[PDB]
Amino acid sequence: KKVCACPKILKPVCGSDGRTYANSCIARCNGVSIKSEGSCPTGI
Structure with missing residues (x-):
C-alpha cells in the first residue's frame, strides 16, 4: 500500500524519453529516469 x-x-524537466513531467520525483515514481539519481528528494 506504499x-x-x-x-x-x-x-x-525535459525527461529522458523526450517528454515533459510535473516534477522529477513523479517521473522516478512512475518508472522513468532523468540521469539525476545522485540528487533526489528520496531519503528513507
Missing part, C-alpha cells in the same frame, strides 16, 4: 511522498514544488 505511496510516493514527492515534493509539491514545480520541477518541469
